[PDB]
Amino acid sequence: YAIPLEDIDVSNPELFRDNTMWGYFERLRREDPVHYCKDSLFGPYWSVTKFKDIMQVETHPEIFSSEGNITIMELPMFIAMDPPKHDVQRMAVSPIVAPENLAKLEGLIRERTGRALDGLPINETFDWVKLVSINLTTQMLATLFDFPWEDRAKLTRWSDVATALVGTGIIDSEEQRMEELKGCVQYMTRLWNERVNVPPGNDLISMMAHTESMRNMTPEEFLGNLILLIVGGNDTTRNSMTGGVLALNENPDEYRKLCANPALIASMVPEIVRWQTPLAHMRRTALQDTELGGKSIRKGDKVIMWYVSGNRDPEAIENPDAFIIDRAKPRHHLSFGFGIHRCVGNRLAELQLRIVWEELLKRWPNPGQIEVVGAPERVLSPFVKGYESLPVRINA
Numbered sequence: 001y002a003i004p005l006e007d008i009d010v011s012n013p014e015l016f017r018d019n020t021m022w023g024y025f026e027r028l029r030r031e032d033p034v035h036y037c038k039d040s041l042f043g044p045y046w047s048v049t050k051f052k053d054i055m056q057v058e059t060h061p062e063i064f065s066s067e068g069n070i071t072i073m074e075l076p077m078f079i080a081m082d083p084p085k086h087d088v089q090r091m092a093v094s095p096i097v098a099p100e101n102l103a104k105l106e107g108l109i110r111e112r113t114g115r116a117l118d119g120l121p122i123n124e125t126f127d128w129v130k131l132v133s134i135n136l137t138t139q140m141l142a143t144l145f146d147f148p149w150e151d152r153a154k155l156t157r158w159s160d161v162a163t164a165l166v167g168t169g170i171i172d173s174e175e176q177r178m179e180e181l182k183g184c185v186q187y188m189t190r191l192w193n194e195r196v197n198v199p200p201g202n203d204l205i206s207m208m209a210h211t212e213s214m215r216n217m218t219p220e221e222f223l224g225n226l227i228l229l230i231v232g233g234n235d236t237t238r239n240s241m242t243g244g245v246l247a248l249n250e251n252p253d254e255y256r257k258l259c260a261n262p263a264l265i266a267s268m269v270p271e272i273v274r275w276q277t278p279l280a281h282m283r284r285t286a287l288q289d290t291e292l293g294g295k296s297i298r299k300g301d302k303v304i305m306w307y308v309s310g311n312r313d314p315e316a317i318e319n320p321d322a323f324i325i326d327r328a329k330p331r332h333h334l335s336f337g338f339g340i341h342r343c344v345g346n347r348l349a350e351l352q353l354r355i356v357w358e359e360l361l362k363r364w365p366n367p368g369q370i371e372v373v374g375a376p377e378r379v380l381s382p383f384v385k386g387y388e389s390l391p392v393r394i395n396a
């Protein structure tokens with residue numbers, strides 16, 4: 001409120017690192033819900049801050065294009081494609097990440113999860129993001145992709161390089177970003193070559209290499225889609241694992257409700273994904289002049305769907321700034337988007353988060369045993385809404 005409406009830049013990454021962006025999004029929802037920003041680190045853009053207006057953008061891909069770039073920050077892959085090619089590639093890829101096709105690998109993830117939790121320090125403060133969230137998410141991706149186990153830290157590195165702003169401690173330049181992602185393409189090409197001329201067996205690289213429909217992708221599209229699948233489920237799962245522990249500590253009546261009725265994992269996991277909003281936005285580009293929420297959008301304009309604001313919109317969600325683990329309709333949220341691009345991995349991602357909560361409560365069943373003892377450090381990004389560290393002590 002101490003700055004002019006016309007000067008609000010909700011994309012400033014410092015607002016996300018400082019956890020001060022909430023107040024700026026609240027002012028826009030009240031006073032200018034479809035908002036033009038002339039000056040930012042990302043050039044000019046529109047902010048879409050209400051639940052119903054994000055739904056209008058998601059459901060009109062013939063007006064609001066995904067082709068070529070789906071973030072505010074300026075290989076082919078089907079998230080960054082419009083129909084018809086989007087729809088052909090999604091129909092090939094959807095069965096690869098469906099739980100119905102993954103039961104044996106998911107039982108192996110549960111065994112590996114239990115072993116990892118059995119190795120955590122007890123009655124000693126540690127960094128939850130390092131020892132649990134990054135550790136378990138990397139073990140899950142390495143299991144699904146049968147990735148060489150000694151090289152699994154490369155998955156975390158490639159994830160960081162894909163999304164990082166220049167000068168945050170990950171890359172020094174766009175030249176460095178391109179050199180590292182060349183390395184990623186070279187590594188995945190070797191795995192493709194080692195699995196295509198041998199009988200399949202049970203991992204996602206073997207499944208894609210032997211799927212007849214994926215012969216109609218170019219090698220560039222095949223590699224682009226393979227790398228989308230490794231990166232797409234990494235930071236999102238990681239920051240949902242961290243967020244749930246923080247939400248239960250900030251809301252002790254919900255931690256008591258969970259421990260008294262562990263079946264509430266079913267309604268809690270979707271509420272963790274809403275409360276966290278691990279990807280704060282997705283971007284579109286206007287293909288035609290259009291009207292949205294009373295504003296004139298021009299052909300070629302950058303249009304930002306702020307899920308971080310839509311998930312807190314009281315017009316759509318009752319008491320939206322409260323964490324409530326037994327809501328009547330807990331899947332009413334925008335963290336997986338909506339429409340033709342709605343997260344193809346959503347049911348697999350939630351299954352992983354339920355496996356983790358079942359295995360945590362098996363070992364530590366009482367309220368307050370998983371205790372946040374220090375402030376989180378947050379990520380410097382307008383896209384990844386997440387945590388670099390979280391000090392935790394397990395009281396057992």
Ligand code: HEC
Nearest residue numbers: 078079232233236237282336337338341342343344345349
């Ligand atoms: C194993 C893979 C994988 C996992 C795990 C995964 N995703 Fe996705 N996600 C994708 C793919 C692939 C797409 C592209 C789908 C498309 O464009 O049709 C996608 C698309 C999305 C989109 C775009 C929605 C839209 O309407 O534009 C969002 C947002 C998203 N994912 C969020 C999440 C979140 C949050 C999580 C975890 C809590 C997650 N994803 C877990 C693979 C994954």
